[PDB]
Amino acid sequence: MAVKIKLTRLGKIRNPQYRVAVADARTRRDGRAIEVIGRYHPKEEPSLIEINSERAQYWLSVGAQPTEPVLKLLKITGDWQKFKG
Amino acid sequence: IQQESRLKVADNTGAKEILCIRVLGGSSRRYAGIGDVIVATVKDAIPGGNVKRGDVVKAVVVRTVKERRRPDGSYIKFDENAAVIIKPDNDPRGTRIFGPVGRELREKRFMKIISLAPEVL
Amino acid sequence: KGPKHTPRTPKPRGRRKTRIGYVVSDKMQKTIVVELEDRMRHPLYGKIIRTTKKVKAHDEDSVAGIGDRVSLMETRPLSATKRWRLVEILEKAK
Amino acid sequence: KSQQKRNRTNERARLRNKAVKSSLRTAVRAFREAAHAGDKAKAAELLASTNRKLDKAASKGVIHKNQAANKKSALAQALNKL
RNA sequence: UUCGGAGAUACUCGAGUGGCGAACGGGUGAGUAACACGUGGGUGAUCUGCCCUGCACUUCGGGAUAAGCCUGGGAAACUGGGUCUAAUACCGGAUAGGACCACGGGAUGCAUGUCUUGUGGUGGAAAGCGCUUUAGCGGUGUGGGAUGAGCCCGCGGCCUAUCAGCUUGUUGGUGGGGUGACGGCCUACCAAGGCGACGACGGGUAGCCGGCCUGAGAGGGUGUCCGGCCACACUGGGACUGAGAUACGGCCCAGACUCCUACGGGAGGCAGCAGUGGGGAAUAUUGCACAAUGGGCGCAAGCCUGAUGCAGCGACGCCGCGUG
RNA sequence: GCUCGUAGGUGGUUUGUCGCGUUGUUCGUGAAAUCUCACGGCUUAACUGUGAGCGUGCGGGCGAUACGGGCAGACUAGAGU
């Protein structure tokens, strides 16, 4: 039971978006997220990122473990690299 | 076993205890052995069963306390007298029995209860 | 980096709610029955009415009589609920 | 199903655990007997073995050490009484 | 190399030991009348493995054994015996002394006390690994974080007085055990209380809430989908393993109901997806796949995933366009 | 049917007091989705999405004390003798 960062599929069927959130691995796809930090869209803008990039450093400092796509988003923002720097 | 004898019904019908009315197999027959048919009434019964008090039904003796001589010299003795209800076409009314039955069932010629036995003796 | 370890973490504690009630009876050996007086409005009509409850003032030394005002405070359970404790004697009975 | 290994290994674990626990309680019995007789020195030696047995098991994960704390602390105080 | 049998050499790998999880996830709402739920507080002697992080350790050994081989049993289920074997398995040495215990002390509490030093006792693991042949994977006790959970508590949320006397484990204390833990939780002794018309005990009815519908709103009705929380898993009961079980796909007992049998003796639990039957006015495809997402193991690739993601049926219901 | 009277309800003039109630402020809380509003996206709509609002409500802390309430006390017309 460890805190991870998941991408929650929300909205309508064929044009959904992904809510960015910190959550325990033992939760469901749409559970009571600990705190939501931004959003993501797969359409319109190529890899549309809308991330606060403020608390990520905190939650990572606690030890939150993001998944693959989350790492990619963090790298596009530079938050992964800036945090690790 | 003869008339005015109460005994337990070792089956899952609903009847609890029956009273011997008349042994079949011959006029003026006094006593029944293992495998004999007894006509009996119902005095105690499970509420909601398939048989109510006052029902008259045939039942087969499968346990006799009084020592019954088996051919080869051995004897079978049970702590209790009991019988199983059967419809008059070799068709046991219930679906299973409670406990063992005797082995002298060749003459009974109802080779199903012997198969429902959890333990033939 | 330091050869020692983390000193401590500032964790301020909470509170223990206090109510001042009337002494009812100490006839229970190290615990006193106290009347808890309160007051609340009906959700709709709004009339202010008083509420009366009973509590178990467990204490290791009964130092109060009857009718006295006493300050009670919440703690860990001890017996059948035993949350209230005797703290202060005030406004003693005539 | 094909997960009977869960059962088998549970059997091994519980077997050894409760065997150990029985041995612990046996030692406790001896210590308490030393308290009744008054052989404090023997109780001290047995308490040392208890220290090398009780916490040894706790380090093997039998308990979460709270039982060790209650038992060693309370009984050490009992020995302080006698 | 028999030319259709060998050499694990090895990528791979049935089977197997060991490790993770299998307690999440999915479904349903019978029971439950407030323990639960909601809300808000406390949780100083409440826990909190897998994550992050600072510190220290990261040593010395033994024996057995499954697997395998031989072998017995039974129809099978399934099992005995003998051989044979390693290990991040088991076991014994500390080779940490934070921490556990006790005494005493220091800084600092009323919130039943936290930090810190000394005195005496005092333990624990860890391991080694394959590999990118050293890129990496690791492993142990701790500090504190973080998560989650537990405990307690105020208040609130049905009907019935044609149920008003309920209460000796009850009420309170001492002591002891036990518990992750305060706690008549348990328990020896002692005391005789405790609840109650500011509705006891009892009956009936019911999963609760965010919320759905109505209504001008106050309120009413409702709480179905979705989402959170709680309980249940053929019925009942109990416990282990475990960081954490009531746990649908785990065991054991009991019981019911099905099934197998060589009749001796055994096996099973769709209130999970779909599906069948029944019931009834009535409620769907034995659908495709794991692409993304989601979860687990593993260094990772990779594997699994009837959850999520997509499709099919009904005008089953909203929105929207035609039928010039 | 009438009266009495218990619990409970209710309670005159007034000094000062506590500030419980109430009020004002502030912090936290009140999850998301849903609802209102405003934007924006699916060819529009429904729908989804963004944001604000709403979240009527609790605790904590902060000021006053009117009124109520409690305590301490007084006067007197109330009531009574």
CSV table of N, CA and C in Angstrom, one decimal, chain C:
chain,number,residue,atom,x,y,z
C,1,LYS,N,23.1,13.2,5.3
C,1,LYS,CA,24.6,13.5,5.2
C,1,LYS,C,25.2,13.5,6.6
C,2,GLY,N,24.4,14.0,7.6
C,2,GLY,CA,24.9,14.0,9.0
C,2,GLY,C,25.1,12.6,9.6
C,3,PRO,N,26.1,12.4,10.4
C,3,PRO,CA,26.3,11.1,11.0
C,3,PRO,C,25.3,10.8,12.1
C,4,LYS,N,24.5,11.7,12.6
C,4,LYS,CA,23.5,11.4,13.6
C,4,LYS,C,22.2,11.0,12.9
C,5,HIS,N,21.1,11.6,13.3
C,5,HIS,CA,19.8,11.2,12.8
C,5,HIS,C,18.8,12.4,12.9
C,6,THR,N,17.6,12.2,12.5
C,6,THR,CA,16.6,13.3,12.6
C,6,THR,C,16.3,13.5,14.0
C,7,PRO,N,16.3,14.8,14.5
C,7,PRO,CA,16.0,15.1,15.9
C,7,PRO,C,14.6,14.8,16.3
C,8,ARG,N,13.6,15.6,15.9
C,8,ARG,CA,12.2,15.4,16.2
C,8,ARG,C,11.4,16.1,15.1
C,9,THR,N,10.1,15.9,15.2
C,9,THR,CA,9.1,16.5,14.3
C,9,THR,C,8.1,17.3,15.1
C,10,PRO,N,7.8,18.6,14.8
C,10,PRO,CA,6.9,19.3,15.6
C,10,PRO,C,5.4,18.9,15.3
C,11,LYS,N,4.8,18.2,16.3
C,11,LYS,CA,3.5,17.6,16.2
C,11,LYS,C,2.7,18.2,17.3
C,12,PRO,N,2.1,19.4,17.2
C,12,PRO,CA,1.2,19.9,18.2
C,12,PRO,C,0.0,19.0,18.5
C,13,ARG,N,-0.3,18.9,19.8
C,13,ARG,CA,-1.4,18.0,20.2
C,13,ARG,C,-2.7,18.8,20.1
C,14,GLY,N,-3.8,18.1,20.3
C,14,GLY,CA,-5.2,18.6,20.2
C,14,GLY,C,-5.7,19.2,21.5
C,15,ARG,N,-7.0,18.8,21.8
C,15,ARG,CA,-7.6,19.3,23.0
C,15,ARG,C,-8.4,18.2,23.7
C,16,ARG,N,-8.9,18.5,24.9
C,16,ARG,CA,-9.7,17.6,25.7
C,16,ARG,C,-10.9,18.5,26.1
C,17,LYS,N,-12.1,18.3,25.6
C,17,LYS,CA,-13.2,19.2,25.8
C,17,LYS,C,-13.6,19.1,27.3
C,18,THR,N,-13.9,20.2,27.8
C,18,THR,CA,-14.3,20.4,29.2
C,18,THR,C,-15.7,20.9,29.4
C,19,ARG,N,-16.4,20.3,30.3
C,19,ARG,CA,-17.8,20.7,30.7
C,19,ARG,C,-17.9,20.8,32.2
C,20,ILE,N,-18.7,21.8,32.6
C,20,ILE,CA,-18.8,22.0,34.1
C,20,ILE,C,-20.2,21.7,34.4
C,21,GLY,N,-20.4,20.6,35.2
C,21,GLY,CA,-21.7,20.1,35.6
C,21,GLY,C,-21.9,20.1,37.1
C,22,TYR,N,-23.0,19.4,37.5
C,22,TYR,CA,-23.4,19.3,38.9
C,22,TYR,C,-23.1,17.9,39.4
C,23,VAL,N,-22.5,17.8,40.6
C,23,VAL,CA,-22.2,16.6,41.2
C,23,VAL,C,-23.5,15.9,41.6
C,24,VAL,N,-23.6,14.6,41.2
C,24,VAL,CA,-24.8,13.8,41.4
C,24,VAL,C,-24.6,12.8,42.5
C,25,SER,N,-23.5,11.9,42.4
C,25,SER,CA,-23.3,10.9,43.4
C,25,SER,C,-21.9,10.3,43.2
C,26,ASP,N,-21.2,10.0,44.3
C,26,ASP,CA,-20.0,9.4,44.3
C,26,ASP,C,-20.0,7.9,44.8
C,27,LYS,N,-21.2,7.3,44.7
C,27,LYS,CA,-21.4,6.0,45.3
C,27,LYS,C,-21.0,4.9,44.3
C,28,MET,N,-19.8,5.0,43.8
C,28,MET,CA,-19.3,4.0,42.9
C,28,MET,C,-17.9,3.7,43.0
C,29,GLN,N,-17.2,4.1,44.1
C,29,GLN,CA,-15.8,3.8,44.4
C,29,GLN,C,-14.9,4.3,43.3
C,30,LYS,N,-14.3,5.5,43.4
C,30,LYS,CA,-13.4,6.1,42.5
C,30,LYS,C,-14.0,6.6,41.2
C,31,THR,N,-15.3,7.0,41.3
C,31,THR,CA,-15.9,7.6,40.1
C,31,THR,C,-17.2,8.2,40.6
C,32,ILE,N,-17.5,9.3,40.0
C,32,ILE,CA,-18.6,10.2,40.5
C,32,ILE,C,-19.6,10.4,39.3
C,33,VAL,N,-20.8,10.2,39.5
C,33,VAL,CA,-21.9,10.5,38.6
C,33,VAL,C,-22.1,12.0,38.5
C,34,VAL,N,-22.0,12.6,37.3
C,34,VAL,CA,-22.2,14.0,37.2
C,34,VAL,C,-23.3,14.2,36.1
C,35,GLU,N,-24.1,15.2,36.3
C,35,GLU,CA,-25.1,15.6,35.4
C,35,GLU,C,-24.5,16.5,34.4
C,36,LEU,N,-24.6,16.2,33.1
C,36,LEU,CA,-24.1,17.0,32.0
C,36,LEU,C,-25.2,17.8,31.5
C,37,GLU,N,-25.1,19.1,31.7
C,37,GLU,CA,-26.1,20.1,31.2
C,37,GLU,C,-25.6,20.7,29.9
C,38,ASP,N,-26.6,20.7,28.9
C,38,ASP,CA,-26.3,21.3,27.6
C,38,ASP,C,-27.5,22.0,27.1
C,39,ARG,N,-27.5,22.4,25.8
C,39,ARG,CA,-28.6,23.2,25.3
C,39,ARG,C,-28.5,23.2,23.8
C,40,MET,N,-29.6,22.9,23.1
C,40,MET,CA,-29.6,22.9,21.7
C,40,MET,C,-31.0,23.2,21.1
C,41,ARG,N,-31.0,23.8,20.0
C,41,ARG,CA,-32.3,24.2,19.3
C,41,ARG,C,-32.8,23.0,18.4
C,42,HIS,N,-34.1,23.0,18.3
C,42,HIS,CA,-34.7,22.1,17.4
C,42,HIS,C,-34.4,22.5,16.0
C,43,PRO,N,-34.0,21.5,15.1
C,43,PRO,CA,-33.6,21.9,13.7
C,43,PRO,C,-34.6,22.8,13.0
C,44,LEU,N,-35.9,22.7,13.2
C,44,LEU,CA,-36.8,23.5,12.4
C,44,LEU,C,-37.4,24.6,13.3
C,45,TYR,N,-38.0,24.2,14.4
C,45,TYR,CA,-38.8,25.2,15.1
C,45,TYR,C,-37.8,26.2,15.8
C,46,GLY,N,-36.6,25.8,16.1
C,46,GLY,CA,-35.6,26.6,16.6
C,46,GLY,C,-35.7,26.9,18.1
C,47,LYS,N,-36.7,26.4,18.8
C,47,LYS,CA,-36.7,26.6,20.2
C,47,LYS,C,-35.5,26.1,20.9
C,48,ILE,N,-35.0,26.9,21.8
C,48,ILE,CA,-33.8,26.6,22.6
C,48,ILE,C,-34.3,25.8,23.7
C,49,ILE,N,-33.8,24.6,23.8
C,49,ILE,CA,-34.1,23.7,24.9
C,49,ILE,C,-32.9,23.1,25.5
C,50,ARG,N,-33.0,22.8,26.8
C,50,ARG,CA,-31.8,22.2,27.5
C,50,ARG,C,-31.8,20.7,27.4
C,51,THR,N,-30.5,20.2,27.4
C,51,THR,CA,-30.2,18.8,27.2
C,51,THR,C,-29.5,18.3,28.4
C,52,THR,N,-29.9,17.2,28.9
C,52,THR,CA,-29.4,16.6,30.1
C,52,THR,C,-28.8,15.2,29.8
C,53,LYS,N,-27.5,15.1,30.1
C,53,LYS,CA,-26.9,13.8,30.0
C,53,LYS,C,-26.2,13.4,31.3
C,54,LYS,N,-25.7,12.2,31.3
C,54,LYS,CA,-25.1,11.6,32.5
C,54,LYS,C,-23.7,11.1,32.1
C,55,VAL,N,-22.7,11.3,32.9
C,55,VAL,CA,-21.3,11.0,32.7
C,55,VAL,C,-20.7,10.3,33.9
C,56,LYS,N,-19.6,9.7,33.7
C,56,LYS,CA,-18.8,8.9,34.7
C,56,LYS,C,-17.5,9.7,35.0
C,57,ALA,N,-17.5,10.4,36.1
C,57,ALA,CA,-16.3,11.1,36.5
C,57,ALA,C,-15.3,10.2,37.3
C,58,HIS,N,-14.6,9.4,36.5
C,58,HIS,CA,-13.7,8.6,37.2
C,58,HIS,C,-12.6,9.4,37.8
C,59,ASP,N,-12.1,9.0,38.9
C,59,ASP,CA,-11.0,9.7,39.6
C,59,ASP,C,-10.5,8.8,40.7
C,60,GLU,N,-9.2,9.0,41.0
C,60,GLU,CA,-8.5,8.3,42.0
C,60,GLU,C,-8.7,8.8,43.4
C,61,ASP,N,-9.3,10.0,43.5
C,61,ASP,CA,-9.6,10.5,44.9
C,61,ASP,C,-10.8,11.4,44.8
C,62,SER,N,-11.9,10.9,45.3
C,62,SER,CA,-13.1,11.8,45.4
C,62,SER,C,-12.9,12.9,46.3
C,63,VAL,N,-13.0,14.1,45.8
C,63,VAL,CA,-12.8,15.3,46.6
C,63,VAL,C,-13.9,16.3,46.3
C,64,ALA,N,-15.1,15.8,46.3
C,64,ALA,CA,-16.3,16.6,46.1
C,64,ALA,C,-17.5,15.9,46.7
C,65,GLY,N,-18.5,16.8,47.1
C,65,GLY,CA,-19.7,16.3,47.8
C,65,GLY,C,-20.9,16.0,46.8
C,66,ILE,N,-21.8,16.9,46.8
C,66,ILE,CA,-23.0,16.8,46.0
C,66,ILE,C,-23.6,18.2,45.7
C,67,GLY,N,-24.0,18.4,44.5
C,67,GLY,CA,-24.5,19.7,44.1
C,67,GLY,C,-23.4,20.7,43.7
C,68,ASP,N,-22.2,20.4,44.0
C,68,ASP,CA,-21.0,21.2,43.7
C,68,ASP,C,-20.9,21.3,42.2
C,69,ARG,N,-20.4,22.4,41.7
C,69,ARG,CA,-20.0,22.5,40.3
C,69,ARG,C,-18.6,21.9,40.1
C,70,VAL,N,-18.5,21.1,39.1
C,70,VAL,CA,-17.2,20.4,38.8
C,70,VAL,C,-16.9,20.5,37.4
C,71,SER,N,-15.6,20.7,37.1
C,71,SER,CA,-15.1,20.7,35.7
C,71,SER,C,-14.6,19.3,35.4
C,72,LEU,N,-15.1,18.8,34.3
C,72,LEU,CA,-14.9,17.4,33.8
C,72,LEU,C,-14.2,17.5,32.4
C,73,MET,N,-13.4,16.5,32.2
C,73,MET,CA,-12.6,16.4,30.9
C,73,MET,C,-12.5,15.0,30.4
C,74,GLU,N,-12.4,14.9,29.1
C,74,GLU,CA,-12.4,13.6,28.4
C,74,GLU,C,-11.0,13.0,28.4
C,75,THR,N,-10.9,11.7,28.5
C,75,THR,CA,-9.7,10.9,28.4
C,75,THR,C,-9.9,9.6,27.8
C,76,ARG,N,-9.0,8.6,28.1
C,76,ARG,CA,-9.1,7.3,27.6
C,76,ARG,C,-10.2,6.5,28.3
C,77,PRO,N,-10.9,5.6,27.7
C,77,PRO,CA,-11.8,4.7,28.4
C,77,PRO,C,-11.1,3.8,29.4
C,78,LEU,N,-11.8,3.5,30.5
C,78,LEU,CA,-11.4,2.8,31.6
C,78,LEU,C,-12.3,1.7,32.0
C,79,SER,N,-13.6,1.9,31.9
C,79,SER,CA,-14.6,0.9,32.2
C,79,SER,C,-15.7,1.1,31.2
C,80,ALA,N,-17.0,1.0,31.6
C,80,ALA,CA,-18.0,1.3,30.7
C,80,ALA,C,-18.0,2.7,30.3
C,81,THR,N,-17.3,3.0,29.2
C,81,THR,CA,-16.9,4.2,28.5
C,81,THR,C,-15.9,5.1,29.3
C,82,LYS,N,-16.1,5.3,30.6
C,82,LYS,CA,-15.3,6.1,31.5
C,82,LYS,C,-14.4,7.1,30.8
C,83,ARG,N,-15.0,8.2,30.2
C,83,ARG,CA,-14.3,9.2,29.5
C,83,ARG,C,-14.0,10.4,30.4
C,84,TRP,N,-14.9,10.7,31.3
C,84,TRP,CA,-14.8,11.9,32.0
C,84,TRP,C,-14.0,11.8,33.3
C,85,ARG,N,-13.3,12.8,33.6
C,85,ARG,CA,-12.4,12.9,34.7
C,85,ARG,C,-12.6,14.2,35.5
C,86,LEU,N,-12.4,14.1,36.8
C,86,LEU,CA,-12.5,15.2,37.7
C,86,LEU,C,-11.3,16.1,37.6
C,87,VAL,N,-11.4,17.3,37.3
C,87,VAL,CA,-10.3,18.3,37.3
C,87,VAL,C,-10.4,19.3,38.3
C,88,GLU,N,-11.5,20.1,38.4
C,88,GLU,CA,-11.6,21.3,39.2
C,88,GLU,C,-12.8,21.3,40.1
C,89,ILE,N,-12.7,21.7,41.3
C,89,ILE,CA,-13.8,21.9,42.2
C,89,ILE,C,-14.1,23.4,42.2
C,90,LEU,N,-15.3,23.8,42.0
C,90,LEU,CA,-15.7,25.2,41.9
C,90,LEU,C,-17.2,25.3,42.4
C,91,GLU,N,-17.5,26.5,42.8
C,91,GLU,CA,-18.9,26.8,43.2
C,91,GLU,C,-19.6,25.7,44.1
C,92,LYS,N,-19.0,25.5,45.3
C,92,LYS,CA,-19.5,24.4,46.1
C,92,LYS,C,-20.9,24.6,46.6
C,93,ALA,N,-21.6,23.5,46.8
C,93,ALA,CA,-23.0,23.5,47.2
C,93,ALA,C,-23.1,24.0,48.6
C,94,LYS,N,-24.3,24.6,48.9
C,94,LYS,CA,-24.6,25.1,50.2
C,94,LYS,C,-24.8,24.0,51.2
